[PDB]
Amino acid sequence: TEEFDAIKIALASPDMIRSWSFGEVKKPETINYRTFKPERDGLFCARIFGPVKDYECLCGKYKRLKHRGVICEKCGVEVTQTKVRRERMGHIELASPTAHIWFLKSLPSRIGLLLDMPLRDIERVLYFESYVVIEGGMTNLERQQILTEEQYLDALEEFGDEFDAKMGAEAIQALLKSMDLEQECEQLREELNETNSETKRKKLTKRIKLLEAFVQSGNKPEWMILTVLPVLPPDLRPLVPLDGGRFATSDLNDLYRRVINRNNRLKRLLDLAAPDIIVRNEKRMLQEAVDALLDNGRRGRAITGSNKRPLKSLADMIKGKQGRFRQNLLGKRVDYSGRSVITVGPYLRLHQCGLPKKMALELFKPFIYGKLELRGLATTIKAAKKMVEREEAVVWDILDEVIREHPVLLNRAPTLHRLGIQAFEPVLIEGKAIQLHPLVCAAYNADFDGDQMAVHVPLTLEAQLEARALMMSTNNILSPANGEPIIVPSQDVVLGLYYMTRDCVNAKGEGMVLTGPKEAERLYRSGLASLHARVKVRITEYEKDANGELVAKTSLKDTTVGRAILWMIVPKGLPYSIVNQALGKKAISKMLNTCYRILGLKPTVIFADQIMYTGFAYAARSGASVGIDDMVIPEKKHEIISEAEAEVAEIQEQFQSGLVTAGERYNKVIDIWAAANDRVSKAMMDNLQTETVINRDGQEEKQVSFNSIYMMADSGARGSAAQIRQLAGMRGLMAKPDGSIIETPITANFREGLNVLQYFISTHGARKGLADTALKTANSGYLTRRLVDVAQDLVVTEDDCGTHEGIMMTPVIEGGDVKEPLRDRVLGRVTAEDVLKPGTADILVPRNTLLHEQWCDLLEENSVDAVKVRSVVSCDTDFGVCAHCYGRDLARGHIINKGEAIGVIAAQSIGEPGTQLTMAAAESSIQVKNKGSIKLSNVKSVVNSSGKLVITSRNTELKLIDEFGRTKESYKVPYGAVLAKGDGEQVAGGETVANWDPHTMPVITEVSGFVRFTDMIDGQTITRQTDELTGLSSLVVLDSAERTAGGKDLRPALKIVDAQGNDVLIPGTDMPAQYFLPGKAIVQLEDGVQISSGDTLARIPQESGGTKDITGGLPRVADLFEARRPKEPAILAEISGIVSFGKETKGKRRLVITPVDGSDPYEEMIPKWRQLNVFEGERVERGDVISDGPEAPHDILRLRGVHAVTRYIVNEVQDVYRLQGVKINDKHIEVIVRQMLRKATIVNAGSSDFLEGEQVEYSRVKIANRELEANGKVGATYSRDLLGITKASLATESFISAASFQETTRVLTEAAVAGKRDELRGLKENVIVGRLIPAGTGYAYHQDRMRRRAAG
Amino acid sequence: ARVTVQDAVEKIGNRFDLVLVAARRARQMQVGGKDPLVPEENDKTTVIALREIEEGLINNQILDVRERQEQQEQEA
RNA sequence: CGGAGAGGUA
DNA sequence: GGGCTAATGACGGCGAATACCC
DNA sequence: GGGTATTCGCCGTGTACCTCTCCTAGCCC
Q1: Minimal CA–CA distance to A731: which of A766, A773, A705, A707?
Q2: Which positions, given as ranges, span the membrane (chain B)?
C-alpha cells in the first residue's frame, strides 16, 4: 500500500500466517561457519524465502544456468524478481501448540493475567512440570487447577470421562479456546450494577478492562499461542562469519535449525504413535528451543567479551544500539557526500558556496555521465568514465550545466540548531577547500581553524526543491530560536562599516556640498576628499507610505562622505536614520532587521550581500591594523596599583595587629583590588575614547578615536570592553583551585610582561575552562537528545481551535529593574482576548489577531501591564497544535502554518545555547527606586497602631503601577514587613517603603495583650533562659528538625490575646494570633507581658540575603526539565480552608487542612527539614505557602493550575538563559511544557480507571464524548501531572518510540495484545518505519493523500 | 534566473505544499508528459518550475485540472 | 567488512 | 585440526533490597 | 509508624576520523 501513517499491530492468526508463506522447509541445513555454502533445503532455500542469489540456481551443490528469472522447478528452486525475494518468507506448521515466552516472562504475564492465576502455574505447565485441569472434572474436582503427577493420576482414576488435564502449551490452548470473552464482559458489567463492594468492584473492573482490551484488539487468545511458526528469509537476519579463529555471533541460525530439528523429531514420533512420556519430552525441549529462539534475554542475558552486546536472539535482534539499526546509530554514512576543510570566499553571494572542482567532479559523476551520454559525447558508461578521467575541457561545460543551479547542502559536524545544515548554490573553484560564504559561518557556529564542513547533494528533483525553498540560507536568515536575523555581519565587514561611517572633526574635503552620493563617491575615490568629513549632501531617500507607495523625499543632510557612499548600498524605501552614526554590530543588526520588517526578504538579502562587499572593501581601504603602540598603557596605572598595595599593606598590618579577622581583611583586599581594576579600566577607556584630538580652525577638539584598537572592539568586531581592558589594563582578579578568588590579582597586562607565577596562576583558569568546555559539550549533546526525544512528536496541524483561553503574559521585572520588556515578549504571539486602552474600554485589537510589530507598537503607546495570549499550553488541539495558539516567531515573519514540527525546533532552540551555559534591598529593607503609585497584591496585613500596615507571609507582592498604565518595579514583601506608605502614594527613589531588621526577621504583633505559652513544655520544647531588659526573655525554640518523642508531640506556640484576657482570631490572614514558633525562634515575650501593636513577638535569625534555592547552568536546566524536587519541595496550601495539627512527628509532622464544604480529613505530611510557616485557625487558599523554601513544579501544577506552572517553568528557564545573555522566545518552552504534562491522572474515574496515567488529549476527547451522550462515563475529573522529560518520552502513546529507546519485548507485547492502533503521529517514528515524516513537505504530502482518500 | 522563493510564498501562503506541487511540476517536465512554459536559461527543471509558479501560471487548481486532463487523454 | 578496547585531532 | 551445536585512579541512574526515628 | 537511607547488582556513553586490536565457544571424530 501507499506510504501511510496510523499503523496497526496485533497478534497474528495461523491461517493468515500460512497465507504469508509459500510452502514449508523440509529439512534444516545451515552453513558451518567454516564452510559458507548455503545448504538446501534448510535456512537457505530459494523456493520459500526467495532466491538467495537471483537469476541462478542455488541448492548448495547446483549452480546450473537455466532459471535466470523464470518460474520452474528443477531441484526445488524458485527464481523471481528481488521484490518476491523480500516478500517470500517461511512457515512451519507445528503439530502441537507452542506458547510465546514474552507474554510469560513479562511482569504483566498476559496468559497469567488473562487466566487469573500467578505465572508460576503457567511456567510449571509449560515447562512440563505439573498438569493443569483443562475444564476437566468439576463435581468434586476443580475446573482450573494445577496438578502434580500423583494428583493428576488421582483425578484420572477418580474420573476419566468427565476429566481432562494436559501438559505444556496444549493445556493453555484448550483453556483459552474455552472462554467466550463477550459473555464474561456482559456478566461483569451487569454484575457491577448489583455489586456494592469497593474491592469487588475494582476486581470486576480490572477483569472486564482486560477482556474488553482483548475484544477490541480483535485477537483471539488461541492465536497468541504459536500454532504455526513463521520464519525469516536467511538474508533478513544478522549473519557475518569471519575467517580464521575469530567469528561472529549467529545464534539465530542454529536456533532455527534446533527448532526445526525438535519439530521434525516430534512429527516423526507422532507419526509412529510414540508413547506419552517420550512425545511429552519431545514437546518439552521443542517448546524450550522455540522459547530460546524467541528470546535468550527471557532465558537470562549475559555479557560476552570483545563485544558489549548479549548473545544474538530474535528478541535481541529486535533492538540493538542505539535502536533499529538502519534508522539511527550506528551509523548511517551516506553516499553522494563529501567533507573538507573550509576557507572564506568574500566574493560569493549569500546563496553561494565555493566548492572545489575535484569535489564537484566526484560528487556529480552520475549526472555528468548522464549529460555526456545525452549530448552523444559518450556511447557507454565506459566511455563516460574515460571521458571524465581524462579531464578534458569538455567535461567543464558538462559540470557547469549540471551545476548551473543544482544546490548543495552544507552541514557542520555538530548540528546544535536548525541552521546547522543549509543549502547553497555551488560555484566551482580552484583549490581543495570549500569556500563558505563569510556571512553564513556565524550561523553555522563554525570557524576557520582546520574544522571540516560536510557537503551532501540532494539529488532528486523534489529534494532539490525542498533545499531551494527551505534549506538555502536566503530563506533561512532569522534564528529559529528567537526570530531575529542570524545572518548578522560578525567581525570583519562590521569593522569596515564602523570605520567608513565614522566621522572626524577635520579632514580633506570638509564642509562642501555634493550632488547626492554620486559626488561623494566621485570625490572620495579621487582621493581629493577624505572619507570622513562634515559634509552637507542633497540626498533623495525613499519612504514607504500609504498603501505601499514610495515617496522620494529629497533633503540636504549633514553626514560624512563615507556615509553617503554607504547610503548608495541601501535600496529604496529605507530611512536615512539607519546609515548615519557610527555603525556598530548592534546598529547593523538593527539595519538588517528593519530592512526585513519593512521591505521583505529580497531587499534584505541584496542589502546583506552588498553591505558585506562594501564592508570588506572599505575595511581593506582602511588598513585597520593591530600593533603594539596602538594598545595604550594608562600613565597612572602604576600609581593606582601602588595605592592599592599601600591600602592592602595597611589592612594586613592591622591583621598582624589583630584588628581584622581573616574573612575581614580578605574581603577588604578583594574590594581594594576590584576598585583598582575598575580605576585602571576607566583610565584606559578614557585614554582610548578621545586618544585622537584634532583642531578645527585652531582649537583642539575631541572626537571618535582614529585608534585601530578602539574601532577594533567598539564596532563589536571582536572582543569586548573586558578583553581590550585585559590587554592594555590588568586582567587582574580571577579564581584559584577550589574556585576562589586570589588575594593578589594578575597585576600585569599582556602588552607588558607576565611574571612566571602570574602565568602559572592564570593557567588554572584556562585549564578549568577547557575541561568545563568539554564536559558542557557532552552534556549539551545529551540534553539536546532527551529534549528532542520528548518533543519530536508535536506538529502544528490545525489553523484555529477557537480557544479563547490563554496565559497572562507580563514584562518580567526583578526588584527595581525591568529585566525584559513586554514589547519583546508580545511580538509574534496571538492575543487570547481583545486588549483595551489603559484609560478607556475601547477595543485596541480585534479578536485573536496576530500581534506583529504594528500592534506591538500600538500596545507600547497604550501602555498595558499584561495581555492574555493564545498558548500551545492553552491549546485544545489534539495530536497537534493550533497555529493561532502558537504564533509565528520563526525564520519567517508570517503566521505559521500546518506541519513544521515545532517540538523539534523548540528542542534544538533550547539545546543550541546549551554550550554557552556555564557553572536597601530584599530581606533588609524594600526601597522603591522610581516614582509611581504604590500597589500591594495578596496582602496579609492588619492596620494596627501607629499606622502600621504590617504585612506578613511571603505571598504578598509590591508592584509599582505608574501613571502610564503598567508597572515598572516589582518586589516580594517578606514576613512582618512594616510599611508607613499606603497604596497609590508617590515615593522617592530608594525610599524604604518597607523596613525591618536585615539579619533577623521579627514577628511583629498586630494585636496587643497577654502572651500565653500555649502547646509548650518548659525545658523540653524551648530553652530555659530569661534575660530581662524590658520584660523580655531569652527563651529559644528548639530547631524545626526532628527531636525527641517527648518534645515533638507539642509544637511551641505564643498565643496573643486582646487587652481583655480573651482569645481573638482574625480571618483571612496567615496570622490568626497564635504564632506557632518555627525552629530557632527566640521567644522575646514571657507569659503575661504587655506590648503594643507593632512589637516583635519572636526573632528568627536570617542571612540578609544569600539563600541557595537555585544552582544555575545546564544542570539546572536539565533538572527543571526533569522537574526534580529542588532541595525537597516546599508544600503549599493543599486546599483552602481552616487548618490544624494532627499527630505531630509520627514519622514526620502531620497537618490537617479542614475545608468548610469539602473533605475535612485532608492532612498532609511535613518533613521537619522544611522551614515551617503554618498556624492553626488561619484561613488559607491554594497556592499559599505552608513550608517555606524552593517549591517543586509538581505541587505547583497540582494546586495553582496549569498556567501557573507554565509561567514558573518558562520564567525559570528564560532567566537561566538570560544569565548567559542568550534570548529565546518562550513559545519553545511552552511547547516543551505541553509535552511534559501531556499525561494526567484521573481523580474521579471516567471511562478509565480511578487513578492511572492517561493522555490528557484522550481525557478531552473522552469527556467531550461524555457530554455528547446523556449517559455520563462517568465523569470525568482529572488533574494533569508533570512527568520528567525521559518519563514523558517513554510515556509516548506510539510504541515505535519505546521500541528503539527503551526495553522492547515487553513494550512490543503490550502493543500486540492491546492491538494498539498508534496514529504514528511521531516523526522519528516515521523515520524508524522508513516512510515519509509527517512534517513540512512530508506532512503536506500525507495531507494530500488523505484528501485523495475517498476522493478517487 | 530566480532562486529566491518569495513570490511563490506570496502566491501560495503555505509555501510548503508549494514545495510539493513545484516538485511534481519539475518531475513531469524533467521526464516527458509536459514541456516548459517559461523560456529555458539552461536552468534545472526545479527553477523553471519555480519561475512558473512565481508568475501565477502554475497554481494548485491549474495543476490538478491539468493532471486530471492528461489522464482522461491517456485512458482515451 | 558487523560491534567493543586504545592514542591523536577538531 | 573439524563439522556440528546447544571491582577501588570512571560516572551516574535505578529498581531491588534493605536501614532507621518517632 | 515510614520515609528516608542505606545496601545490592546492571547498564548507558555528545560530535567525526586517523591509526591500532578484538571479536558465540565446546567439542567428540
Answers
A1: A766
A2: none
Cα of A616 to nearest chain B Cα, Å:
25
Resolution in Å, one decimal place: 3.3
Domain A636-768 has CATH 1.10.132.30: yes
Judge whether B49 is closer than 8 Å to chain A, CB to CB: yes
Q: How far is the CA of A1187 from the C1' of D21 (A)?
A: 21
Please list, in sequence order, all residues whose beta carbon lies within 8 angstroms of the beta carbon of residue A1121, skipping any fewer than 6 positions away.
Answer: A783, A786, A787, A1232, A1236, A1284, A1285
User: How many whole angstroms separate alpha carbon A1217 and alpha carbon A918?
Assistant: 10
CB–CB of A924/A801 below 8 Å?
no
Domain A926-994 has CATH 3.40.50.720: no
Contact A1313, A213 (CB under 8 A): yes
Cα of A386 vs its chain's centroid, Å: 53
The answer to whether some atom of strand D lies closer than 7 Å to the beta carbon of A1154 is no
CA distance A826 to chain B (A): 23
Angle between helices A365-374 and A381-389 (to 10 degrees): 110
Q: Do A313 and A194 touch, CB atoms closer than 8 A?
A: no
> Rounded CA gap, A888 and A904, in Å?
15
Helix (H, G, I), strand (E, B) or coil at A174: helix
CB proximity A34–strand E (7 Å threshold): no
Distance from CA of B58 to the nearest CA of A (A): 15
Q: What distances in angstroms separate CA B19 from CA A468, A523, A565, B14, one per listed residue? A: 9, 49, 40, 9
Note whether A1080 and A1039 are within 8 A (CB): yes
Cell numbers at A1169, concatenated:
527539614
Distance A331 CA to E20 C1' (A): 21
* Nucleic strand D within 7 A of Cβ A1124: no
Q: Chain B partners of A408 at a C-beta cutoff of 8 Å?
A: none
CB of A1042 nearer than 7 A to strand D: yes
Task: Show the cell assigned to A255.
Answer: 536456533
The three grid cell numbers given for residue A512, joined into one nine-digit string: 562642501
- Interchain contact A470–B (C-beta under 8 A): yes
Comparing CB atoms, the residue among B8, B43, B45 nearest residue A461 is: B45
Q: Does B22 touch chain A (CB under 8 A)?
A: yes
Residues touching nucleic chain C (CB < 7 Å): A 238, 240, 242, 248-249, 306-309, 321, 330-331, 413, 449-452
The answer, for B14 touching chain A at a CB cutoff of 8 Å, is yes
Q: Count CB neighbours of A558 within 10 A.
A: 10
Residue reference for cell 546544535: A416
CB contact under 8 A, B47 and A405: yes
B16 with A1336: Cβ contact below 8 A: yes
Q: Which method was used?
A: cryo-EM
Interchain contact A1341–B (C-beta under 8 A): yes
Q: How far is CA A475 from the centre of its chain?
A: 25
Bond before A94 cis per omega within 30 degrees: no
Residues 6+ apart with CB under 8 A from A729: A634, A637, A677, A680, A681, A683, A684, A749
Q: Which residue has the least CA–C1' distance to nucleotide D3?
A: A32
To the nearest whole Å, the CA of B43 is away from the closest chain A CA by 6
The single-letter DSSP state of residue A899 is B
C-alpha A1136/C-alpha A1153 separation (Å) is 8
H/E stretch holding A538 reads: strand A535-545
- CA-CA-CA-CA torsion sign (A1226, A1228, A1229, A1235): positive
Per 3-state DSSP, what percentage of chain B is helix, strand, and coil (rounded to 5)? 60, 0, 40
In degrees and rounded to multiples of 5, residue A631 shows phi and psi of -65, 130
